[PDB]
Write a protein that binds this ligand. Sequence first.
Ligand code: NA
Lengths: 336, 143
Amino acid sequence: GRGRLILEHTLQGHKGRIWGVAWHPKGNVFASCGEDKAIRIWSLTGNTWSTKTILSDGHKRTIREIRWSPCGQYLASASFDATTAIWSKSSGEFECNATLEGHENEVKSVSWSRSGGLLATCSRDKSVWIWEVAGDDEFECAAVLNPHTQDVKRVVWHPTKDILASASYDNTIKMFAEEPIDNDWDCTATLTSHTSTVWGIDFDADGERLVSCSDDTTIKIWRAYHPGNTAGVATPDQQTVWKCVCTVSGQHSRAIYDVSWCKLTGLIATACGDDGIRIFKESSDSKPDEPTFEQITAEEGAHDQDVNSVQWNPVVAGQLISCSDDGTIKIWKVTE
Amino acid sequence: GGRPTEIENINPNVYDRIKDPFDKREIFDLIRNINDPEHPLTLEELHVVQEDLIRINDSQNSVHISFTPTIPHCSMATLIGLSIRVKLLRSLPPRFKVTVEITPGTHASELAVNKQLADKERVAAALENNHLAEVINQCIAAK
Ligand code: NA
């Protein structure tokens, strides 16, 4: 299209592949993690990004993902050492406050709820855990959820409600919520459509839609239909049902490892194993039951190896960050 | 990607490019002498790897290995494919995308074995296992 994806900065720091990047809630700081078992916190000084602090010795194995609390004071890191660590600054220096254990195997993902009072993890052991966050060293396990039949890749909390979405090697996405009467966490829905591993999931602004990305080289848009919906979608269990209302096919050569839906612009970014970053925008005339999403720009050689993650800046509209197996982090500006 | 470039268009980057490299034989030489985990023979001697089951394009940083387990219920199929992955990871420059798949129709569980071998996250976790990496290095080392 007429859009453009412009490179602004290229950063390294880590030795080896970089698995994840995560913007701080205020957009002038981000964290990165990788194979080298370190977390790096980067900050903007003028027009130059640089590593401000390095968090080593928190994990004995690969760090797969980091996410900031919504308040920006806490960082959670998920590691192949079967633990999740929580970091915060109280002395002026980031320190590890607590370590959450319990998974049998590698922890793949971590996610904070909107209020910051809940924390979710998922593992190669096929389970999803939900923790209640009550203090800097005060965590109680609220649920251990085993609906998935294979390694669980990602967990993402709903932007408005305490709904948890999980994506799995078993090709499905699942939705969790507290049962009203007794407040037990249970599985509310299963999203079936992808023909291979679901790597990434992200909600749109109001949380009424979800975008997923898969080893099957497609991304899908899911819409939620609540009981009593006008559209006539059946809700037999009196639960919200999600239906695949759009599939974007033929745009990715290899597995799509991450997808990010910008709450400020509504743009969708994908990270692909073919080294490409692609940007999608909803069509002006698209119908809510059959939306159309068009690629407005791309950078097919964005990195020199697989792109592992793409993340929209939560404050700076149109600013994107990516990281790659090539050992680089890149910061981009998208113009429509 | 996926759907090909419209035939009427040529990629501008490509046009300028058009304006020594790895071949099947070189790749075959890298993996033909990998040892079987259980037997004192090479993957070539067991008909597990063959030159004609190798596909490579240097310019597009891609190599594809098809391997044939010795039996349709082979319990070592993932370990064999993983040893191929490790060999090519070390020997080839890091730009290369390596795909290792069971030859179609030659294993009762080929879909599930292929899916594991193609999951770079699970492969990376597996290669952090000191025991597994040791066994794989044993298989790879030529004699
Ligand atoms: Na508290």
